[PDB]
Amino acid sequence: VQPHVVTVLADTAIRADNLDEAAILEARKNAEQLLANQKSDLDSAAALAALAETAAQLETIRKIKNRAQ
Amino acid sequence: KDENGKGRDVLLFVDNIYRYTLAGTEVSALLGRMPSAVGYQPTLAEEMGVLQERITSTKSGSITSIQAVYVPADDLTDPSPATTFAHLDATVVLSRDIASSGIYPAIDPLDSTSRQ
């Protein structure tokens, strides 16, 4: 506190009336948790898969390039 | 026959055996023969073999055959390279890209084989 500015460096605080509002902080907690699930659920599923099939069967083409018969 | 013994070995070296097949091709049509699966002559294998079998080493004498084989359009599986192919113990093929990569000799490590 200063005669003109006061502040609190919060270890953890929530705009709330009581610890009963713990039912509210977990809402954002699990929200970000769900997002953390989502980032993987897309990342590997999109990137790893499609890129896996990309280079997969290309060889049989590159070997038959100059085929005259 | 060697003087008092079996003959000295034979060093044989041939350039562009494929040109033989090409020469046959040049007239194959003019013989009234219909074209083979490609413009090649359908006789191809026979005149190939009669050539090839005259190269084996016998009880008398030994012949060392070296043959450079042109590859049309770098197509290893044109009829002529494939058909020729079954008459050699040692296989040595060059790859255009590897030479384009600057290496000499440009011998493919992969395809080139030897029955030994």
Residue B34 forms contact with A (CB below 8 Å): no
| Whole-angstrom distance, CA of residue B40 vs CA of residue B22 | 8
Does the bond joining B109 to the residue before it have cis omega, within 30 degrees of 0?
no
* Residue whose token pair is 């590859």: B71
B65: β partners:
B12
The sign of the torsion formed by the CA atoms of B37, A60, B82, A67 equals positive
Q: Which member of B37, B38, B73 has the closest CB to residue A66?
A: B73
Please state, in angstroms and rounded to a whole number, the distance separating the CA atoms of residues A63 and A41. 36
> What is the residue-wise DSSP string for A3-48?
SS------SS--S-SSGGGHHHHHHHHHHHHHHHHHHHHHHIIIII
User: C-alpha A24: how far from its chain's center?
Assistant: 22
The phi, psi pair for B94, rounded to 5°, reads -100, 150
Cβ count near B72 (within 10 Å): 14
Phi, psi torsion values for B55, nearest 5 degrees:
-125, -5
- Nearest CA-CA partner of B77 in B37, B50, B107: B37
Query: B109, exposed or middle or buried, with CB in 10 Å at 0-12, 13-18, 19+?
Result: exposed
Peptide bond connecting B105 to the previous residue in cis, omega within 30 degrees of 0: yes
Helix, strand or coil for residue B52?
helix
The residues, ordered by sequence, that sit 6+ positions from B116 with a Cβ below 8 Å of its Cβ are: B89, B90
Computed on alpha carbons and rounded to an integer, the radius of gyration of chain A in Å comes to: 28
Do residues B95 and B108 make contact, with C-beta atoms less than 8 angstroms apart? yes
**Experimental technique:** cryo-EM
Distance from CA of A62 to the nearest CA of B (A): 13
DSSP 8-state code for residue B59: S
